[PDB]
Amino acid sequence: PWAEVCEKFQAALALSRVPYKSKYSARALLEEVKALLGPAPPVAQRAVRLAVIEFHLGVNHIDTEELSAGEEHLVKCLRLLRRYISLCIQAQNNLGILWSEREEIETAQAYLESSEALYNQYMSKRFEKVYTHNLYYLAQVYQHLEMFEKAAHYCHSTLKRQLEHNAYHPIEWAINAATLSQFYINKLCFMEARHCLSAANVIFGQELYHQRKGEIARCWIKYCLTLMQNAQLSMQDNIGELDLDKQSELRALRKKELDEEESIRKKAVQFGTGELCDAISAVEEKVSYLRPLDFEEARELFLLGQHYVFEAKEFFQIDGYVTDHIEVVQDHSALFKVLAFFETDMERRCKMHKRRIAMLEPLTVDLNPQYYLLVNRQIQFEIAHAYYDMMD
């Protein structure tokens, strides 16, 4: 009655999928399976089958992970597994999270490392999934280990596999780019970061339905902010009209070739297999921006395009964060004019100043004693009048 046994297994299996809804009877099924271990009695493969059963019995022994006996059983299973398919590393990973509970990171680390090594040592749905799950688990570990860059590497590879397959959702993509941006900003790899949000711009082809756009625009602002901060490598208050004393190399073939060498890695992000790489290629027009000089006009236009989005986000904010983001844009706008170190232009100052006044009034809505919130706004006026002083 081998099949009948397998049917009982099947049933139990289905029941494992199924006022307690679990344990009560599931534990009986655990034992029912053990009862079937009886009947189970080449033999080597029998043992393999049995080991798998024991894996599931170990899984049955969880109960909020209180059943450490199950842990022991899994260890016993591991031994049996080590004697000589991929479930074994899945199980290993399950042991890894128990070490996490036991704070034994190092062993869990080793487990995960070997899980990957074994795949690589080797060389229609499960693998695709768990492969990336493992990377996720590693990232968590890395957080504790502070392996910053490795976690980042994995992030990209999970997005990679996501791209390989059809596991998509536009918002998630957008926010992913949002985080990646900042990462590379902190790492100063601006030139790579360039493709990230712009990659999301490709994604844009398909509540947050409309609101999501502003978050994106915020990030676009941040790009530009950092780019100006890059300009701040050479500070105006220690120089006169002279600058760019440094080398040119703004079109260096040196940089081109070295980037070609580096971009062997970088370009992996272009998982558009030509088609979307072409979409990206259209987008590359803006990705091309690197170390510009007299393009302040263009710089402001970059804002403008996303300023329109900003305006929409104002529609999407409840007269609170509206003013918070206006602050951002105002300063940002002023900074573009800061870049434009020319005498005949204080109009932006005036333009944003008008906004400052309008933004002051809202204290009527917020009469909480938000002293420093107001002080910040007052500081913005300090700055405004400091800029007046700057002018005169």
Residue numbers in the entry: 5 to 22, 32 to 54, 86 to 128, 135 to 173, 200 to 282, 301 to 486
Question: What does the original paper state about this entry?
Answer:
Kinesin-binding protein (KIFBP), which is mutated in Goldberg-Shprintzen syndrome, binds to and inhibits the catalytic motor heads of 8 of 45 kinesin superfamily members, but the mechanism remains poorly defined. KIFBP interacts directly with the motor head of Kinesin-2 (KIF3A), Kinesin-3 (KIF1A, KIF1B, KIF1C, KIF13B, and KIF14), Kinesin-8 (KIF18A), and Kinesin-12 (KIF15) family members, resulting in inhibition of motor-microtubule binding both in vitro and in cells. We show that KIFBP is a tandem repeat protein constructed of nine helix pairs that assemble into a solenoid-like structure. Collectively, our work describes the molecular mechanism of KIFBP-mediated inhibition of KIF15 and KIF18A via binding to and stabilizing a conformation of the kinesin motor head that is incompatible with microtubule binding.
After determining the structure of KIFBP alone, we used cryo-EM to determine the structure of KIFBP bound to KIF15. Unexpectedly, when we docked the structure of KIF15 into the reconstruction, we noticed that the α4 helix of KIF15 was missing. Instead, we noticed the presence of an additional α-helical density within a cleft of KIFBP, suggesting the displacement of KIF15-α4 into this cleft during complex formation. In the structure, KIFBP occupies the microtubule-binding surface of KIF15, sterically blocking access to the microtubules by KIF15. The most notable structural change involved the repositioning of KIF15-α4 away from the kinesin motor domain, placing KIF15-α4 15 Å away from the location found in the crystal structure of KIF15 (37). The adjoining loops on each side of KIF15-α4, Loop-11 (“KIF15-L11”) and Loop-12 (“KIF15-L12”), accommodated the repositioning of KIF15-α4 by facilitating the extension of KIF15-α4 away from the body of the motor domain. Whereas KIF15-L12 remains extended in solution, KIF15-L11 is positioned away from the motor domain and binds along KIFBP-HP4a. In addition to seeing changes in KIF15-L11, KIF15-α4, and KIF15-L12, we saw that the overall structure of KIF15 adopted a more open conformation. The structure showed the shift of α helices KIF15-α1, KIF15-α3, and KIF15-α6 away from the core of the motor. Thus, KIFBP blocks microtubule binding by sterically preventing microtubule interaction in addition to allosterically altering the KIF15 motor.
